[PDB]
Amino acid sequence: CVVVEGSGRVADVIAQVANLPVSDITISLIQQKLSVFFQEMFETFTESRIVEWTKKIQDIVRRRQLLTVFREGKDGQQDVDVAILQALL
Amino acid sequence: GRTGLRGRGSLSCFGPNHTLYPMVTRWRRNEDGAICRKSIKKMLEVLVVKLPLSEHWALPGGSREPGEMLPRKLKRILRQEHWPSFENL
Numbered sequence: 001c002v003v004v005e006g007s008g009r010v011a012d013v014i015a016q017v018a019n020l021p022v023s024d025i026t027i028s029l030i031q032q033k034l035s036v037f038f039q040e041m042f043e044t045f046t047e048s049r050i051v052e053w054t055k056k057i058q059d060i061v062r063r064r065q066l067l068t069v070f071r072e073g074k075d076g077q078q079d080v081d082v083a084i085l086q087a088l089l
Numbered sequence: 090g091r092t093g094l095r096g097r098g099s100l101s102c103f104g105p106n107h108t109l110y111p112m113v114t115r116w117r118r119n120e121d122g123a124i125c126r127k128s129i130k131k132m133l134e135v136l137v138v139k140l141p142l143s144e145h146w147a148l149p150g151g152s153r154e155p156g157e158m159l160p161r162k163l164k165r166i167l168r169q170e171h172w173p174s175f176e177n178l
């Protein structure tokens with residue numbers, strides 16, 4: 001799975017927690033980064049939704065092999081192709 | 090230390106002139122009634138006064154020349170007359 005940086009809500013909150021160690025995720029940090037990007041519906045979040053999304057983001061960023069960020073390099077803004085090839089390999 | 094002016098000035102007496110500064114605090118709710126949120130912390134509301142020739146908002150705090158009605162010395166005309174003693178209780 002390749003995520004694209006500078007795109008939207010869920011993309012940015014996955015792309016920020018890419019290179020982080022797996023134990024360094026705090027459930028406080030999740031809702032902190034969540035409510036700024038979800039600032040339209042940030043107040044619509046409950047604690048059970050926060051712990052579910054924290055568990056899911058944890059179990060995703062564990063498997064570091066199967067994920068890549070596009071990084072939105074934005075100096076050439078080359079293609080999706082350069083990302084998709086490394087995410088294949 | 091030193092201030093640069095000898096004397097009493099516009100103060101009542103020498104040494105300290107004792108006064109009480111009360112503050113009222115409450116939370117700031119959204120349209121739903123939940124607490125509005127900052128980046129991390131929350132939003133707070135204080136009740137302030139503006140005098141006609143002060144051009145400034147300030148705390149309703151009075152000189153502690155009377156004992157218990159020093160908030161009333163700030164807020165007899167501001168708060169109430171009889172219910173003011175109840176809120177002072």
Ligand SMILES: Nc1ncnc2c1ncn2[C@@H]1O[C@H](COP(=O)(O)OP(=O)(O)OC[C@H]2O[C@@H](O)[C@H](O)[C@@H]2O)[C@@H](O)[C@H]1O
Pocket residue numbers: 140141142143
């Ligand atoms: N900590 C302070 N910070 C800033 N200004 C101050 C402070 N303390 C006093 N002042 C200013 O000094 C001036 C004289 O002080 P007092 O008159 O003793 O203060 P107070 O009794 O709280 O204010 C009386 C108010 O009634 C009006 O007639 C007059 O305009 C004044 O605003 C006031 O205009 C007040 O704004």
